[PDB]
Design a protein around this ligand. Structure first.
Ligand code: HEC
Ligand code: HEC
Ligand code: HEC
Ligand code: HEC
Ligand code: HEC
Ligand SMILES: C/C=C(C)/C=C/C=C/C(OC)[C@@H](C)[C@H](OC)[C@@H](C)CCc1oc2c(O)c(OC)cc(OC)c2c(=O)c1C
Ligand SMILES: C/C=C(C)/C=C/C=C/C(OC)[C@@H](C)[C@H](OC)[C@@H](C)CCc1oc2c(O)c(OC)cc(OC)c2c(=O)c1C
Lengths: 245, 125, 93, 53, 385, 385, 93
C-alpha cells in the first residue's frame, strides 16, 4: 500500500510517562486542560469525562466547582412542569459544543470532530500520533498533491487529507504557570491531558503493577525451588537389573 | 499400518541390490539420528502396545525377554525425567537392536487376517 | 455401580503392566540431600545440550519461513513505491 | 540455618503463624512500594503541583 | 480405607487430583491442561463480576463497558484481565493442541479425548466472538456482521438463518442483547465439555514424551504434579500480570474504542489475533461458498489425524522427518496468521494460498506419506533376512 | 459386554436411567424427583430465551419485560411459562420434601442425600427471589428492599453488608443489574447441586413405601419407571398449561404490574405464595433480630430430623401416632402460610405464634417423644417373656 | 479406578440381599392379557378403600385446623365492624 495512504509513521517522543515506574506529569495535565478549554473545546466534546474526575488530579475542588457552574444543565421541571436550567455541578460531564451530530457537521464543512475522550487509545501511535498530527502541518502540500476544497494536508493522517485545519500557533494561550505557550509546548500538554482523559487509572495501575510483578515473581522463584525439593527423591532415584534365573 | 505391510515393502527393498545399497545407509543413519538407542531402548520397545495384536504378542513373549523389556522401559523413563542420556557405554549397540517382538506380531497379524477371511468366506454352488 | 469396559490402565496394585521381576530401585530422602544444587558446576554444561540437538528441526523451518516472509514483504514495499509503480500495474489485475 | 531452629525449631511454619504474618506484610509491603513510587515520581504528582499553587 | 477414598464426593477428587497415577516422565508440556482450566475460571469469574455493571442494550453497551472502565472500583483490572485472559486462553490452547500433535496424543485409545477437545476448540472460538461483540466497538459490529453472514452461504435457507440470528434487518439491539445472553451461556457448556474431556482422559491416563506405555512406573498426581503445575501457574500469572498492568491494550485493536457505526467499516478493520490464520484461509479462496467451506474444513480436518498417521509408534520424539515437517506446519500456521494481518496485495495473496495448501497438505499428504516412509526406514535399518 | 455399558458416557446414562435397580413397590410420590428435573429445564430454557430480550437497566427493566409480553413472538408464552413454572417448581418441591419427610427418607444412610436437598431448597428460594426482582414491579422493588435488609440484623457489620449488596444508598440500578447477573448464575449452581443429590442417591438407591429393604425384589429403571414417569410428566404439563393459557396471573400479585416506586410501599404488599409460611414465622416474633434468626432456623431445623426421629423402623406407613401428627404438621404449615396472607390483626397474630411453636415443636418434641412411645408400644404389644 | 466404600445396595447379580431359596415366581406376557380391563368389576370396588383407612388420619387434622381458622377468622371480622368497635378497642392494644 502506498505510504501516502498508510500515513507517515509517527516518531517516538520521550514522554514523561512512558515507563513502568512513571506517572503522568500532572503539571502538564493541568496545562492540558487549558489548551483544551480555549482551543479544542470549540469543536471537540469530552462526553466521558465527569467534572469530579479532575478534582485531585489537575485542579482543586473549588476550581472544578467553578469551571462546572459556568455551564447550564437540564434540571427537574418546577411545580407546573416547566423545563428549567441549572448551573453545572461536580457530578456532571463536560458539555460538548454541539447539541447533536447534524449541527456539528454544519459547523465543520460536513465533517464530524470525534469526541476526544478515548482518542489516544482509538489510534495507533497514541500520544506520539496525536502529538505528531497536531504539530506536523506543513505550510504547503507537497508538489503534485491536489487537495479537495476545504481540506488540509497533514502527512501523519492516513491519505494525507484531513478536514481539520491547523489550530495550534505560538503564544495563543496564556499559561497560568508562566510556561512559554509555543505551538509544540501546547501539543505536548493537550496530548498528556487527553491521555489522562482516556486512561485515568494510569498512575494507580502502574503502582499495583509493581506490587503484582514483585509478589508473583517471588512466588514463581519460590515455587521452582519448592518443586525441586519435593521431586528430589524421584530425580536422583537409581535402578539396578538382575535377570532372574 | 500393519507390520505384515511394513515387512512386505521392506524385504522387497532389502532383496533387490539396487534399492538395498541405496536405502540401507539412509535407514541406518535415520535410526542413529532417531536417538532411542541413547536411552537404552530397542525399536521394538517403542511399538505402541494399546491394541489387541500387540497385547497378544507381549503375552506370548518368553518370560526373560519380557522382564528385560520391562527394565529397559523403566530405565528410559527415569533417564528422560532426569533430562540426561544414559552413559554412552549403556547405549544399545546396533547389534543388540534386534526385532525380538516382531515375529510374534506377524504371527498374530496373519492369524487375525485368516480369522477375518474365514468369517466372510462366500460359498459357490 | 455396574462394570465398565476394559482399558489400558488400572490403578495402584493392578496397573496392568507386565509382571516385574529383577528390577531393584534405591532412592534417598530429599531431607537428606544437598540443599538444592546441581544447578551450575555439574549441570550447567549439561543444560542446553537439548535444543542443540533439536534446534535444527526448529531453525531450518523458521529460516525457510522468515526468509520467505521478508523476501515477499520487500517486493510489496517495492511495488507500492514510486519505482515499482510500473511493474505494479503489470502484475496487479 | 540456626535462625530457623530458634524461631520455629525444625517444625514447618504453622498455618496460623502464616496468616498472622500475611496481614503484617500487606500493610508494611504496600507503604514501602507507595513511598518508593511517589518519591521516584516527585515533581509530577498532584501533591507537588498543588504546592506550586 | 481412608475417608478421601470412601466418601462419595471426596473420592472423585482423590482419584483425579490426589492418587491419579501419572507417568513419571511427563514434562512441562503436560502442564498446559491445568492452565486452560485456570483460564476458564478467570474468564468465568471476571465475567460474572462485570455482568453486574454491563448493559446489553445497543445504546448503553459500549458506554457501560467504559463505565466499568472508569466508575467501577478495580473495574479496569476486571476488564483488562478478561480481555487479556481471552488472548492468553488461546495462546495456551494452541500450545496444548500443539503438544497433542507432536506427541501423538490423538491416536492410541485417546481418540475420543481428542474429538471432544476439538469440540471445545470450536465452542471457545464461538464464545470469544460473542463476547467480543458485547463491547460494540467498530471491530465488534463489523465482526458481528461478517461472522453471522458466514451463514448466508448456505444454499437456500441461508439468508433466513442470518436475519434470524440478527433478529432484524441487520446487526442491531436484538443481536447484541441476544449475543450477551449467549456469551453468558456457552462458557457453562464449555465447563461441561471439559468434564467429559477429563472423563475420557481418566480412563486411559495421560500420555508421555516417549510415546510408550507408562504402566511400569507411575507417581501419584499429588505431592508432585500439584506442585509442578504450581510452577507454571505462577509463571502464567506473572506474564499475564505484565500485560494487564503494563501493556493492557497491546493485544487489542484501537478501532474497538470508537463505538460501532453501521454506515462505516474502518479501512483498518482487522480480526482479533487468534482468528487470523483462519481469516487468512478464507481470504485465500476467491469464492464466497468455498472460502467459508474451506475455512470450517481447516478446523474440522483436525479430526482426520488418527487415521492419516500411518506410524506404528506414537509421537515425534524418535522420528526425524516427522519433527522437521511438524515444524514446517507450526511456522506455516504463524505465516498464515501473518498473512491475515497484511492487505490483499500482490506478493501476499499467492503466499496465502500456498500456505493454505501446505496446511491442508500436512494432514492429508505429508503425515500419511512420511509416516509410511519412516515405518520402513525403521524396518530395513536393522533387519537382516 | 453391551455398548450402553462399555462406553464412558453411555454407561453413566445407563446406570442412572436404564439399568438402575429400583424397588418394585415405589409409588407415585417417587415421581416428584423427575418432575423437579423437568422444572429446572423449563426454567432454564425459558429464561435464556427471555434473556435475549431483557434489559436489567432499572429504567428499562420493567418495560423490557412488557416488550417480551407485547412484542416478542410467543413472548407471553415464555413469560407465563417461566412465572408459573416457578410456582409449580415449589408446589412440587414441597411435595417431594413431604414424601421424604413422611417415609423417613432423611434417615439411615441417606442423610447426606437429604442434607444436599436442604441446600438446594435454600438455593432455589434464593434464585426465585433474584428473578422476582428483575421485573422491577412494586412487589419486586419492595421484596428487593426488605430481603436484603434481612442482613442489617447482623450486629456489627450489618448495614455494611446491606449497602454492599445494594451497591448504593438504596435499591437502585446497581442492585437490579447485579441481581439479574446472579439470577442467571445460581441456576447453573443448582444444576451442579442436583448432580450431587443424584450421586448421593445412586449409592443407596431409592427407598420404598414399606420403609424396609428393596434388595430382594428389584426392577430396572428402564421400561417401567421411564414410562411411569411419563404419566406424571404429562399430567404435570396439562395442569401447567391450564394456568399458563387460561389463568396466567392467578398465582401472581397485581401490584407487580405497576412499575416499582421507591417512595411508596403499597398497602397491598404480600410475599409470593410459596414464601408465606416463612414470612409468617418472621412476623410472629416482635423482635427484629429474633425474627430473622427464627425464620432462618425454621429452614435449618430440617437438618435435625435424622437425630430426633428415634424410631427403630423407617417411614410412617405403620405408625398410627406418627401419621396423625404428620398431617397435623402439614395443615399447620398451610395455616402458617394462610396467616401470612392475612393482616397483623388480633386473632391472627396469636394464631401465628401458636403455629410457629407447633412447627418447631414438631421436629424437636413431638417426633422424638412420639417415636420413643411407638417403639415401646410395638414391643410390649407382643412380648411375653 | 480405585475402590469405594461399602454401600447397602450393589447391582444385578450381587444386589446385597440375603440368599434366596424356595421362592418361585410365575408371570405372563402383557401380550397374552386382556386389553387392559381390571378397573370396573374387579378393581373399582377395590380402590378408594385405599383412602378409607387413611381418611381419618388426614380428615381430623384437616378438621381441627379448618375449624380453628374459620373460627378466629370470624372474630377478626367481628372486631372490625361497629358491633365490636368496643370489644376491639379492648383486645387491641
Ligand atoms: C473545529 C474547527 C476544530 C478545532 C478547533 C479542533 N479540531 Fe480536531 N478535528 C476537527 C475535524 C474537522 C476533525 C475531523 C478529521 C477527519 O477528517 O476525520 C478533527 C479531528 C481530530 C482528531 C482526529 C484525527 C483522526 O485520526 O481522525 C484529533 C486527534 C483532533 N481533532 C485533535 C484536536 C485537538 C487536540 C484540538 C485542539 C488543539 C483540535 N482537534 C481542535 C475539527 C477541529
Ligand atoms: C457474564 C459472564 C461472562 C462469562 C462467563 C464470560 N464473559 Fe466474556 N464478557 C463478559 C462481559 C460482561 C463482557 C463485556 C465487557 C468487557 O469487554 O469485558 C465480556 C467480553 C468479552 C470479550 C471482549 C474482550 C474485550 O473486553 O474487548 C471477549 C473476547 C470475551 N468476553 C471472552 C470470553 C471468554 C473466552 C470467556 C470464557 C468462556 C468468557 N468471555 C466468559 C461476560 C462474561
Ligand atoms: C437468564 C436465564 C434465566 C434463568 C437461567 C432463570 N431465569 Fe428466572 N427470569 C429470567 C428473566 C429474564 C426474568 C424476567 C422476565 C420474567 O419475569 O419472566 C426472570 C424472572 C423470574 C421470576 C419472576 C416471576 C415473574 O413475575 O415473571 C421468577 C420467580 C423466576 N425468574 C424464577 C426462576 C427460577 C426458580 C429459576 C431457576 C430454577 C430461574 N428463574 C432461572 C431469566 C432466567
Ligand atoms: C484438540 C485439542 C484439545 C483441546 C482444544 C483441549 N484439549 Fe485437553 N487434551 C487433549 C488431549 C489429546 C489430551 C491428552 C494429552 C496427552 O497426555 O497425551 C488432553 C489432556 C488434557 C489434560 C491433562 C493435562 C495435559 O495437558 O495432558 C487436561 C487437564 C486437559 N486436557 C484440559 C483441557 C481443557 C481445560 C481444555 C479446554 C478448555 C482442553 N483440555 C482443550 C486435547 C485437547
Ligand atoms: C429437603 C430435601 C430434598 C430436596 C429439596 C430435594 N430432594 Fe430429591 N430427594 C430427597 C431425598 C431424601 C430423596 C430420597 C427419597 C427416597 O427415594 O426414599 C430424594 C430423591 C430424589 C430423586 C429420586 C426420585 C424420587 O422422587 O424419589 C430425584 C431424581 C430427586 N430427588 C431429585 C431432586 C431434584 C432435581 C431436586 C430439586 C431441584 C430435589 N431432588 C430436591 C430429598 C430432597
Ligand atoms: C450464536 C453464534 C453464532 C451466530 C456464530 C458464531 C460462530 C462463528 C465462528 O466459529 C466459531 C467464527 C468465530 C469463525 O470460525 C469459523 C472464526 C475463525 C472467525 C473468522 C473470521 O473472523 C473475523 C473477525 O473477527 C473480524 O473482526 C474484525 C472481521 C472479519 O472479517 C474481516 C473476520 C473474518 O472474516 C473471519 C473469517
Ligand atoms: C443475592 C441474594 C441475596 C441478597 C439474598 C437472598 C436470600 C434470602 C432468602 O432465602 C434464600 C429469602 C428469599 C427468605 O428466606 C429466608 C424468603 C423466605 C423470603 C422471606 C420474605 O419474603 C418477602 C417478600 O418476598 C416480599 O415481597 C414483597 C415482602 C416481604 O415483606 C414485606 C417479605 C418478607 O418479609 C420475608 C421475610
Amino acid at each position: 500500500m502506498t505510504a501516502a495512504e498508510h500515513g507517515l509513521h509517527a516518531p517516538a517522543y520521550a514522554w514523561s510517562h512512558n515507563g513502568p515506574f512513571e506517572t503522568f506529569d500532572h503539571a502538564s495535565i493541568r496545562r492540558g486542560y487549558q489548551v483544551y478549554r480555549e482551543v479544542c473545546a470549540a469543536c471537540h466534546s469530552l462526553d466521558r469525562v465527569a467534572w469530579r474526575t479532575l478534582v485531585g488530579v489537575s485542579h482543586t475542588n473549588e476550581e472544578v466547582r467553578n469551571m462546572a457552574e459556568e455551564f447550564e444543565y437540564d434540571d427537574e421541571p418546577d411545580e407546573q412542569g416547566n423545563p428549567k436550567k441549572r448551573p453545572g455541578k461536580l457530578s456532571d460531564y463536560i458539555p460538548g459544543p454541539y447539541p447533536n451530530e447534524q449541527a456539528a457537521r454544519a459547523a465543520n464543512q460536513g465533517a464530524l470532530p470525534p469526541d476526544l475522550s478515548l482518542i489516544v487509545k482509538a489510534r495507533h501511535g497514541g500520544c506520539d500520533y496525536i502529538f505528531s498530527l497536531l504539530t506536523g502541518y506543513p505550510d504547503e502540500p507537497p508538489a503534485g498533491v491536489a487537495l479537495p476544497p476545504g481540506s488540509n494536508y497533514n502527512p501523519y493522517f492516513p491519505g494525507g487529507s484531513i478536514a481539520m485545519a491547523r489550530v495550534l500557533f505560538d503564544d495563543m494561550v496564556e499559561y497560568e504557570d508562566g510556561t512559554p505557550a509555543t505551538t509544540s509546548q501546547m501539543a505536548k500538554d493537550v496530548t498528556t491531558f487527553l491521555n489522562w482523559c482516556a486512561e485515568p487509572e494510569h498512575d494507580e495501575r502502574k503502582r499495583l503493577g509493581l506490587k503484582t510483578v514483585i509478589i508473583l515473581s517471588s512466588l514463581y522463584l519460590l515455587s521452582i525451588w519448592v518443586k525441586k525439593f519435593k521431586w528430589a527423591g524421584i530425580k536422583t532415584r537409581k535402578f539396578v537389573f538382575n535377570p532372574p534365573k | 499400518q500393519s507390520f505384515t505391510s511394513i515387512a512386505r515393502i521392506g524385504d522387497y527393498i532389502l532383496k533387490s541390490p539396487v534399492l538395498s545399497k541405496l536405502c540401507v545407509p539412509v535407514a541406518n543413519q535415520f535410526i542413529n539420528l532417531a536417538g532411542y538407542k541413547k536411552l537404552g531402548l530397542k525399536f521394538d520397545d517403542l511399538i505402541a502396545e494399546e491394541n489387541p495384536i500387540m497385547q497378544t504378542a507381549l503375552r506370548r513373549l518368553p518370560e526373560d525377554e519380557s522382564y528385560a523389556r520391562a527394565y529397559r522401559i523403566i530405565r528410559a523413563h527415569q533417564t528422560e525425567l532426569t533430562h540426561h542420556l544414559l552413559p554412552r557405554n549403556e547405549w544399545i549397540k546396533a547389534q543388540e537392536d534386534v526385532p525380538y517382538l516382531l515375529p510374534y506380531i506377524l504371527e498374530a497379524e496373519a492369524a487375525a487376517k485368516e480369522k477375518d477371511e474365514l468369517d466372510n468366506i462366500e460359498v459357490s454352488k | 455401580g455396574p462394570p465398565s469396559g476394559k482399558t489400558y490402565m488400572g490403578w495402584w496394585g493392578h496397573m496392568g503392566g507386565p509382571k516385574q521381576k529383577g528390577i531393584t530401585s534405591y532412592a534417598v530422602s530429599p531431607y537428606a540431600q544437598k540443599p538444592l544444587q546441581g544447578i551450575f558446576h555439574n549441570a550447567v554444561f549439561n543444560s542446553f545440550r537439548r535444543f542443540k540437538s533439536q534446534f535444527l528441526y526448529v531453525l531450518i523451518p523458521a529460516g525457510i519461513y522468515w526468509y520467505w516472509w521478508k523476501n515477499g514483504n520487500e517486493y510489496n514495499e517495492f511495488l507500492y513505491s514510486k519505482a515499482g509503480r510500473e511493474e505494479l500495474e503489470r502484475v496487479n489485475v | 540455618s540456626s535462625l530457623y531452629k530458634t524461631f520455629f525449631k525444625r517444625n514447618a511454619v504453622f498455618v496460623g503463624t502464616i496468616f498472622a504474618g500475611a496481614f503484617v506484610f500487606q500493610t508494611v509491603f504496600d507503604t514501602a512500594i507507595t513511598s518508593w513510587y511517589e518519591n521516584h515520581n516527585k515533581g509530577k504528582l498532584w501533591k507537588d503541583v498543588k504546592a506550586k499553587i | 480405607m481412608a475417608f478421601r477414598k470412601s466418601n462419595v464426593y471426596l473420592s472423585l477428587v482423590n482419584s483425579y487430583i490426589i492418587d491419579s497415577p501419572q507417568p513419571s516422565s511427563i514434562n512441562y508440556w503436560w502442564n498446559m491442561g491445568s492452565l486452560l482450566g485456570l483460564c476458564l475460571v478467570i474468564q468465568i469469574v471476571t465475567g460474572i463480576f462485570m455482568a453486574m455493571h454491563y448493559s446489553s442494550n445497543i445504546e448503553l453497551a459500549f458506554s457501560s463497558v467504559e463505565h466499568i472502565m472508569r466508575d467501577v472500583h478495580n473495574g479496569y483490572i476486571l476488564r483488562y484481565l478478561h480481555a487479556n485472559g481471552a488472548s492468553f486462553f488461546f495462546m495456551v490452547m494452541f500450545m496444548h493442541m500443539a503438544k497433542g500433535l507432536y506427541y501423538g496424543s490423538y491416536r492410541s485409545p485417546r481418540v475420543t479425548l481428542w474429538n471432544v477437545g476439538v469440540i471445545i476448540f470450536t465452542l471457545t472460538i464461538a464464545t470469544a466472538f460473542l463476547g467480543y461483540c458485547c463491547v460494540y466497538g467498530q471491530m465488534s459490529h463489523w465482526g458481528a456482521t461478517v461472522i453471522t453472514n458466514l451463514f448466508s452461504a448456505i444454499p437456500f435457507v441461508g439468508n433466513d438463518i442470518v436475519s434470524w440470528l440478527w433478529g432484524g434487518f441487520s446487526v442491531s439491539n436484538p443481536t447484541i442483547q441476544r449475543f450477551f445472553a449467549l456469551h453468558y451461556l456457552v462458557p457453562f457448556i464449555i465447563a461441561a465439555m471439559v468434564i467429559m474431556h477429563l472423563m475420557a482422559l481418566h480412563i486411559h491416563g495421560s500420555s508421555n514424551p516417549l510415546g510408550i506405555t507408562g504402566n511400569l512406573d507411575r507417581i501419584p498426581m499429588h505431592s508432585y504434579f500439584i506442585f509442578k503445575d504450581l510452577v507454571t501457574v505462577f509463571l502464567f500469572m506473572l506474564i499475564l500480570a505484565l500485560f494487564v498492568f503494563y501493556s493492557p491494550n497491546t493485544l487489542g485493536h484501537p478501532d474497538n474504542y470508537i463505538p460501532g457505526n453501521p454506515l462505516v467499516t474502518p479501512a483498518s478493520i482487522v480480526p482479533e489475533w487468534y482468528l487470523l490464520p483462519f481469516y487468512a484461509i478464507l481470504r485465500s479462496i476467491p469464492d464466497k461458498l468455498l472460502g467459508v467451506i474451506t475455512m470450517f474444513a481447516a478446523i474440522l480436518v483436525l479430526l482426520v489425524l488418527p487415521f492419516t498417521d500411518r506410524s506404528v509408534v506414537r509421537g515425534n520424539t524418535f522420528k526425524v522427518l516427522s519433527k522437521f515437517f511438524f515444524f514446517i506446519f507450526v511456522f506455516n500456521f504463524v505465516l498464515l496468521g501473518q498473512i491475515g494481518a497484511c492487505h490483499v496485495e500482490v506478493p501476499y495473496v499467492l503466499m496465502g494460498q500456498i500456505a493454505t495448501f501446505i496446511y491442508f497438505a500436512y494432514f492429508l499428504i505429508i503425515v500419511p506419506v512420511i509416516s509410511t516412509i519412516e515405518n520402513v526406514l525403521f524396518y530395513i535399518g536393522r533387519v537382516n533376512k
